[PDB]
């Protein structure tokens, strides 16, 4: 497997990433300024999102740092260690996340009005702040501004074919 | 110069940094789950913090995050190069502190009931969010727990005292 030492090495990655617990997240490196993500497992399955703008540098040789806000209030910051297969996030989840995740699980780029409404109505503080490792368990070329990555809800066995070579064709893309 | 490898060479050292704006940050990894910090220049000069807590990681050989989350709804994610004199930091200020950043100016520790009334108060949202790279330009080693190192508010010659040797002892220590 290559070896990752620049930004560019770094952008156009797709990831899998799996905690302790066995949750299972899904991140997309678009391009140096936006991201897409989807979530399998956990608290929040079943939510995924496109076109999320980011900050996204790289802090040393194959070191790279991700920062965003949410529609919803959440902040994050992604920390990616590729070449150990590695990755550090903390997330920063306003108070009403907590008590009402199901309200995020949907396609948030359709309901963005609804997550700013709720951010406002509902409480911030205290936030609920989860800074926790995972292993990486995939890393696909996407290529960067690649559309197809995550273009739909994601499905109990969506991580196991992508792994397996099912999911994408081989320029990357759905058939 | 000594090279950093583990949490242990991390913890316990304190930091003077600077942005490309001239600004002034100081920080002190206090132990393994608290932080201090003391503010020179920008929007909140003269605000100073101890005993924060905070969850402090090695992300792999030499490189460091902290994430915290303030009485002032502030979230924050560092991550310190020791070995390269940088910092990368990313601070998720909620709306009220950019319009009103004034309130946070003070020894926080003697204000924290204003500021969780304020943070209720005054508006969240939009974020401002500042993800910026610093140069480190002093490191000692102050060792652990050492509750001299930020110790008093700011004064516009600090950081040179401290950088000339004329500011600690041969301990570490306030004389």
Do not use: C
Request: proline share 5%; net charge negative; glycine share 6%.
């Amino acid at each position: 497997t290559k070896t990752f030492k620049t930004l560019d090495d770094f952008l156009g990655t797709h990831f899998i990433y799996t905690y302790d617990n066995g949750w299972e997240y899904e991140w997309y490196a678009k391009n140096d300024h936006t991201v897409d993500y989807r979530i399998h497992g956990g608290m929040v399955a079943g939510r995924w999102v496109t076109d999320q703008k980011a900050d996204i540098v790289m802090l040393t040789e194959g070191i790279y740092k991700i920062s965003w806000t949410e529609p919803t209030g959440t902040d994050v910051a992604l920390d990616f260690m590729p070449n150990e297969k590695k990755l550090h996030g903390t997330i920063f989840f306003p108070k009403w996340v907590e008590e009402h995740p199901e309200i995020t699980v949907t396609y948030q780029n359709e309901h963005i009005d609804l997550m700013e409404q709720s951010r406002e109505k509902y409480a911030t503080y205290p936030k609920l702040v989860v800074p926790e490792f995972a292993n990486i368990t995939y890393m696909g070329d996407a290529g960067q501004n690649n559309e197809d990555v995550i273009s739909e809800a994601p499905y109990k066995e969506m991580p196991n074919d992508i792994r397996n070579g099912k999911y994408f064709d081989q320029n990357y893309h759905r058939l």
